[PDB]
């Protein structure tokens, strides 16, 4: 039962709430290590917890790899978004983070630590504003400002540290020295004046991807991403990821989960309790699979429950009720299907002859109220009203799950095993365009006209 429930606080094997907010993860040896920070009673840096696991669902407490006792300046300060990276050369784990006074946010500086072991007590080094010796001034103080940060290890073995500089208006990508413990140079300035936060740097197939968020404090916002063949330059524009609130969370880290079947990229986020006036320690977590439609097209769907099999390297949606269904039209006798049985995103939904194919099989996931999710079997995509249309003739397609109301459907029994499937967005029924009775008939959205082309029978398979 390797299933995770988003919007909650995961519990470790001990039965206690996991506290690794704004944390990250590292895959070394046979274990996945989850680092993170958490405040105390005075909302100050208490410690950087570390959790270990092989299945990525059951986490074991390993203590604080970093504490407020590890250093004199760690006593009364703010530490958030701590990330850990491994060095093949040295053989030691280097840890980066964001440091503040605890009184204010004027000291936008980065902090560094390291240890010979992953779950061992780290030794704090120093806190500083990158390029301090260069003499450069960034808003009153020497050295580039450094708040929200993250680490990345390239294929060539070069370490990288990224953080928000120039009052969180610009992103600075710093190249680290071979030891990962110092900054070697300023690789490039990314997305200037665009004010992107909570950056996550990853790589797939010679393509670098940068998942960022907006700057609106606790309030969740529209997450975005970009790609490039080179870190120095060639970066694309910003493309929206997830919904308008990133499913009520903020991106924190993204790691490749490799297994026998292949590689599935895992997304980590934080549902900050600050949104509803709660303390940082009451923040929940949101884990979702990061899917790659193409080298240039990314997808971040929202599953209320996610199943993970680290061994095989598969991250997909968890369906509570695996019961398969066929939706047969009363008028045509055809069943609900996907055009050309495609698994592509935004694929047109059409009616087709009952041929017992996968494309014609659908799950039904309850999502509160009298509404449900109609999910295709051949493709985990959900039945969706294109562009959240509220007009007659509005085409229906299969799209990535995004918790949108244009993906919620209510079944209204009309008798004899037939239903009127209305959308939650406007209330219009699933309709076969122009009363079509042939294969390829466009499935659309239309007002309840009492027509038989709007009536569907639910059949178990
Ligand atoms: O493309 C399908 C997709 O559309 C979303 O609606 C978007 C729409 O894509 C976009 O063109 C428009 O500018 O904004 C709409 C929402 O704000 C749906 O949300 C999604 O479920 C899919 O249907």
What would your notes on this structure say?
This is Ricin B lectin. One of its GO terms (molecular function) is hydrolase activity, hydrolyzing O-glycosyl compounds. Beta-D-galactose binds at residues 384, 387, 402, 406. Belongs to the glycosyl hydrolase 43 family. This protein is an all-beta fold and 461 residues long. The chain has 2 domains: 1-321, Glycosyl hydrolase domain, family 43 (Tachylectin-2, Chain A, 5 Propeller), CATH 2.115.10.20; 322-461, Trefoil (Trefoil (Acidic Fibroblast Growth Factor, subunit A)). Helices cover 0% and strands 48% of the residues. The strands form 10 sheets. A 6-stranded antiparallel β-sheet has the order 27-38-35-34-31-30, with no helix packed on it. Strands 28, 29, 32, 33, 36 and 37 form a 6-stranded antiparallel β-sheet that branches. It is elongated and about 75 Å long.
Which SSEs are present, and which pair or pack?
Layout: E1 3-5, E2 21-28, E3 31-39, E4 45-53, E5 60-67, E6 78-86, E7 93-100, E8 109-115, E9 123-128, E10 137-138, E11 141-142, E12 149-153, E13 159-165, E14 170-176, E15 183-190, E16 197-203, E17 208-213, E18 223-225, E19 227-228, E20 239-241, E21 250-258, E22 263-271, E23 284-292, E24 298-299, E25 305-309, E26 314-317, E27 325-329, E28 335-338, E29 347-352, E30 362-366, E31 371-376, E32 382-385, E33 394-399, E34 408-415, E35 418-423, E36 429-432, E37 441-446, E38 456-460
Antiparallel strand pairs: 1-25, 2-3, 3-4, 4-5, 6-7, 7-8, 8-9, 10-11, 12-13, 13-14, 14-15, 16-17, 17-19, 18-20, 21-22, 22-23, 23-24, 25-26, 27-38, 28-29, 29-33, 29-37, 30-31, 31-34, 32-33, 33-37, 34-35, 35-38, 36-37
């Amino acid at each position: 039962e390797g299933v995770i429930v988003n919007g909650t606080q995961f519990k470790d094997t001990s039965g206690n709430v996991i506290h690794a907010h704004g944390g990250g993860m590292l895959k070394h040896g046979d274990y996945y290590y989850w680092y993170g920070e958490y405040r105390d009673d005075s909302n100050l840096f208490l410690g950087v917890s570390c959790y270990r696991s092989k299945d990525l669902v059951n986490w074991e407490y390993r203590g604080e790899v970093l504490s407020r006792n590890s250093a004199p300046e760690l006593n009364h300060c703010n530490i958030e978004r701590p990330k850990v990276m491994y060095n093949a050369s040295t053989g030691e784990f280097v840890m980066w983070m964001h440091w503040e006074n605890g009184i204010n946010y004027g000291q936008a500086r980065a902090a560094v630590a390291y240890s010979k072991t992953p779950d061992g007590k780290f030794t704090y080094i120093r806190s500083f504003r990158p390029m301090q010796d260069t003499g450069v001034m960034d808003h009153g103080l020497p050295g580039y400002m450094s708040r929200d940060c993250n680490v990345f290890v390239d294929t060539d073995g070069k370490g990288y540290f990224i953080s928000a500089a120039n009052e969180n208006m610009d992103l600075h990508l710093y190249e680290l020295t071979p030891d990962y413990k110092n900054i070697a140079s300023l690789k490039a300035k990314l997305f200037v004046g665009q004010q992107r936060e909570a950056p996550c740097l990853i790589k797939r197939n010679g393509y670098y991807y940068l998942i960022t968020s907006g700057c609106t404090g606790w309030n969740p916002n529209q997450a975005k991403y970009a790609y490039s063949k080179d870190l120095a330059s060639g970066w694309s524009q910003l493309y929206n990821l997830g919904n308008s609130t990133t499913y009520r969370s903020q991106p924190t880290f993204i790691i490749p989960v490799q297994g026998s079947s292949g590689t599935s990229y895992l997304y980590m986020g934080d549902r900050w309790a600050g949104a509803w006036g709660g303390k940082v320690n009451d923040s929940q977590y949101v884990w979702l699979p990061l899917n790659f439609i193409s080298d240039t097209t990314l997808e971040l769907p929202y599953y209320d429950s996610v199943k993970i099999d680290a061994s095989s390297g598969i991250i997909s949606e968890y369906i509570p009720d695996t019961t398969r269904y066929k939706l047969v039209n009363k008028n045509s006798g055809k069943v609900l299907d996907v055009l050309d049985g495609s698994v592509d995103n935004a694929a047109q939904i059409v009616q087709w002859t009952d041929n017992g194919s996968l494309s014609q099989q659908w799950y039904l996931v309850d999502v509160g109220g009298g509404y449900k999710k109609i999910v295709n079997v051949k493709s985990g995509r959900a039945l969706d009203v294109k562009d959240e249309s509220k007009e007659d003739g509005g085409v229906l397609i299969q799209y990535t799950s995004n918790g949108g109301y244009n993906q919620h459907w209510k079944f209204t029994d009309i008798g004899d095993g037939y239903y009127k499937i209305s959308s939650r967005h406007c209330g219009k029924l699933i309709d076969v365009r122009k009363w079509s009775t042939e294969d390829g008939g466009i499935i659309q959205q239309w007002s309840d006209a009492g027509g038989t082309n709007q009536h569907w029978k639910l059949v178990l398979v």
